[PDB]
């Protein structure tokens, strides 16, 4: 029953593989050869947010590229203004730990998760005037490893249970499952649209999920380790994946297969967050190495680099209007480069 | 109107900066501790779990890990800022004191884990006894082995389980010394199922630990 | 895709001997520290043997310390067992294992809920 | 005692002494 | 009849993933050149911004 | 200063002359001596005079008065009087040396601790309560060294050179002195009580032990300066503060004296400890010996331990053997303590190498062109 079912997963594999090779009738590093340099990119820090006693996890900039949420192990969420540097709202988490922060496109609500496997989303309205749970989700048996709002009423979350889920609000049950991976999922990212998504794992493999139907369409193995970060490609039909192979690899969901990859000999890090800028030119890619590198996206070469902090860089977030980048990392400093 | 709200966020601030200067000084002076341990060990002496208590008015938080999965690779890069790492083992199927070792060992080489000590419990004291009539099996190196001139036996107790006692913790202290001894050291103990003194060793080694980290900024250890 | 194929086994008798192989294939095999884990019928995953990147560092589980060799061959890029002085008590599936992490010397490859990254397995029985 | 102050105090104690040695013969200074 | 029941899934898995519409690699390439094109020079990463706009200057 | 009383002194001697004249040679006032009846054509011998310290009481000095009644033709014969400047002149040469080695090592100890301090201040990661006490200290260093240039240079003006302007300017000169000197002692006993209450306390209040700290060693020394200034200005208040009245001086050597057995104390407590710590770290040899015999040489010149082989000796002789012995090593060790603490515990330090080294990296990496 066993060996007619493997020999025959093998065969299909074997089949969508030469059609990969097929299709294959040449690389993106070909036809860029005529393409100008972006020259040397010298970015600036122009703020330094000093508020967080531990080390800094998470990050995620808001629709209006002013307010941000931060996510630290102390146990204190701050909400910090980017312009003057005012500390907006701090708001202090029943558990220690927290893995995962979201901030929803119109800003009535944050949502933070952790170890503790009950993800709290906060209104932030508050006509009384403090911060209260809303509502508490407890449906999970691993640990909340990332979540994004969609909207106002429903939030997609990833579990260290194999599985991805979807919730509603307002009710506080899970609309569906996501059942396809075969490891740690560590995190996900939503398109423009908010109609497909991707999933990163720890089993070298990324599913392309459809939200409203409840199964995944595509399944991407390029990489040799386990994938920490994922950014979709401005337009949507693309993506970038950052492995613990120290290789950063750009995969396409019609050509169904990886058009680049991003390789340096004096680079052997890890990579813990990427984020494509606004035109999608450049890259920035985290590395473990304390310092961010700038990929050129189109001509895979360094553009520059960010050395500016003194521990491992753990989030990267660009604004929705390419106007600053935000890195936050374990020495319990927030950079914003120009 | 453009001037009361930067007065308005400025008062904001300054309430934030005082109740992060309150919280901060909490932070820094409780101690923290991670309780990891077999399942077959005695880890009672959602998904984490969390004891809070104070000894010579000093607090203790310590964290057991609940119901979690068993790919550990991931989510232990979160602790690499407790005080102290608590290891349990029971002595006794399979070889459960090897994956002891292994998992020791992994804990021991990984690069986020070099500035975090190390407590180890060394349980069921009480089986080893019950075990000496009916072990050297598993281990070929039990026989060339002698007890320790330095090590002194409590009474009562048949010299062949206290060398089976010092071949365990030695086996550990092989792995503790085989690599990266300047900056973190391994402490380990004796415990029987039933007792009341792991309190008070837990917390004359924190105190030792966090000297240990006062003199290593002084570059005297 | 990273795709591990173990190779060899089948019944022998105690005292003989025996060979086993693991094609890797497609990762880079240099820059990988390997391992053997081994499930016994009706018991858990135990650590068997690795081998460092080199192959400098070797070790062994004690009750098969000096009984066995592992080899790994950069050149093809496949792991070598050889199996010498065979025990009635040493059937197992045998499980040719990668750690997830390269240039690094911890490893945590004895879960048994579905880790990715070791082969198939094959049966060794005596 | 502070070897600082002691050498202060010596010589002090040394330097006090150039009404005796100007008054009694002042043909060294003329 | 669990695990048989997974390695059918897996294989159902696989015919779902293989039966899509698969687009040549130099044609997907080249919507993303156009893409980068016609959005070059909106970015205020690759051209830096005069100070009198930028809000953190 | 004494040379006012001196004069007073000899005017108040003029005046008992002149109430005892209120054929011989008839007694008369010649502003050193009063001259008793003399015998004419002889020699009238008078005792070297009784009030002064450094002269030879014993000699006399032969003046002849003639048969006229007036002073031969004025004949004075001191020879005899004057038999201990040659050995002063003599003892001077030997001050000289010691007079610039101290200059030479708080020259050096000046030069040293600017880059110490630029490089603390300037660094964001190198800012910590522990490294706010290192710049106190270096700081103390600091105004030691300039308090010491100060007063060279009112010792020059002194030595090699209005009056009444000298007198305040010595005043303020001294009292800054013995200030800045007292709270470098007290700053070491700072450092000695936060190392031995990290060991000894496992937690501590940073906010606390901070301004405590602060106090205890700026604010303290000025009420013990104050006293003895407010003391000194009581009973004598004339001339400089240099000469020394008697028990007084003992106000601010006394609470000095007990900050450095004090201090003595708590290190050889703390080093007992690391004993126990390296033989801890055996049973968990050569190696922890020689670990042992660094770690007390980079603490033996932070708690100046040295000061302890002569810290409580009396007042000796102006010259000798044990005087020159003891001022030689102090004003040696004293000098060179500063340009120790700063190659030990700044330069060698492992996170200020790494801080620069990455500094030195981002440079390089920017001139790239
Ligand atoms: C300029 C002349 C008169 C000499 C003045 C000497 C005294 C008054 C000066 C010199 C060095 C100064 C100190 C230098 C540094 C600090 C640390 C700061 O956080 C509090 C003030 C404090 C403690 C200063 C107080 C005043 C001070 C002690
Ligand atoms: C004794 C006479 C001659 C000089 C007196 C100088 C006095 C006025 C000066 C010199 C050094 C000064 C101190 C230097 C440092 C501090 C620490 C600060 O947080 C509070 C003020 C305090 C405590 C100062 C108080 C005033 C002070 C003591
Ligand atoms: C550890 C520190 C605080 C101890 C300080 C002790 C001080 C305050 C005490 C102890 C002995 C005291 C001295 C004892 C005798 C005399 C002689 C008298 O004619 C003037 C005061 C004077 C000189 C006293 C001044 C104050 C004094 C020096």
Known sequence: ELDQLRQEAEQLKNQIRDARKACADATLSQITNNIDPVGRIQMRTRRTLRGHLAKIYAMHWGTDSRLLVSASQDGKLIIWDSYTTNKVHAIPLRSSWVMTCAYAPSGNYVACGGLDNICSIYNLKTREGNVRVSRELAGHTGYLSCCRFLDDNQIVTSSGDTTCALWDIETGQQTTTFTGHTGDVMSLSLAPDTRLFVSGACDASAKLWDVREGMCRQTFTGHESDINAICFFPNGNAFATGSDDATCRLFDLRADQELMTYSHDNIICGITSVSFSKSGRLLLAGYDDFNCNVWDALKADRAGVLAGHDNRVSCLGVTDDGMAVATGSWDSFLKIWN | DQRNEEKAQREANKKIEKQLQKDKQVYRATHRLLLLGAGESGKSTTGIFETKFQVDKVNFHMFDVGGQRDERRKWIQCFNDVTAIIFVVASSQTNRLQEALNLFKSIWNNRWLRTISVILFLNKQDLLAEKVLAIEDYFPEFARYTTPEDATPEPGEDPRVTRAKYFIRDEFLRISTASGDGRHYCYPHFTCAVDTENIRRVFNDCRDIIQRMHLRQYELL | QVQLQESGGGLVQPGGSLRLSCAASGFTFSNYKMNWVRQAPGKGLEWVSDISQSGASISYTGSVKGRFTISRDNAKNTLYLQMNSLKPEDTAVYYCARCPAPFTRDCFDVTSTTYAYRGQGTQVTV | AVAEIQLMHQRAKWIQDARRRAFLHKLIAE | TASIAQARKLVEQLKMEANIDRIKVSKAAADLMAYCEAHAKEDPLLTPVPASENPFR | ?369
């Open chain 6, 1 to 369: 200063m004494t040379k006012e009383e001196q004069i007073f002194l000899l005017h108040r001697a003029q005046a008992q002359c002149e109430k005892r004249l209120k054929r011989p040679c008839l007694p008369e006032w010649d502003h050193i001596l009063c001259w008793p009846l003399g015998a004419p054509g002889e020699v009238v011998a008078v005792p070297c005079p009784d009030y002064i310290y450094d002269f030879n009481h014993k000699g006399h000095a032969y003046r002849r008065c003639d048969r006229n009644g007036s002073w031969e033709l004025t004949w004075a014969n001191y020879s005899e009087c004057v038999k201990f400047l040659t050995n002063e002149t003599r003892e001077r040469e030997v001050f000289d040396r010691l007079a610039m080695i101290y200059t030479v090592g708080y020259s050096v100890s000046l030069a040293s601790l600017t880059v110490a301090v630029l490089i603390l201040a300037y660094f964001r990661r190198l800012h910590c309560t522990r490294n706010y006490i290192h710049m106190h200290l270096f700081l103390s260093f600091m105004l030691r060294a300039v308090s010491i240039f100060v007063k060279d240079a009112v010792l020059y003006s002194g030595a090699t050179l209005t009056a009444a302007a000298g007198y305040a300017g010595c005043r303020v000169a001294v009292t800054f002195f013995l200030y800045f000197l007292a709270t470098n002692y007290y700053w070491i006993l700072v450092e000695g009580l936060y190392l031995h209450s990290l060991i000894f306390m496992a937690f501590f209040s940073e906010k606390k032990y901070l301004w405590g700290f602060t106090v205890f060693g700026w604010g303290l020394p000025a009420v013990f300066v104050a006293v003895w200034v407010s003391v000194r200005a009581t009973l004598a208040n004339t001339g400089c503060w240099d000469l020394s009245s008697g028990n007084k001086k003992w106000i601010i050597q006394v609470p000095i004296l007990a900050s450095i057995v004090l201090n003595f104390i708590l290190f050889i407590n703390i080093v007992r400890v690391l004993a126990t710590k390296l033989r801890e770290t055996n049973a968990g040899t050569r190696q922890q010996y020689r670990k042992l015999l660094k770690s007390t040489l980079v603490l033996m010149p932070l708690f100046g331990v040295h000061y302890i082989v002569f810290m409580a000796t009396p007042y000796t002789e102006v010259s000798g053997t044990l005087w020159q012995v003891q001022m030689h090593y102090e004003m040696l060790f004293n000098s060179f303590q500063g340009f120790f603490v700063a190659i030990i515990y700044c330069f060698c330090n492992g996170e200020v190498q790494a801080e620069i080294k990455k500094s030195w990296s981002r440079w390089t990496l920017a001139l790239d062109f």
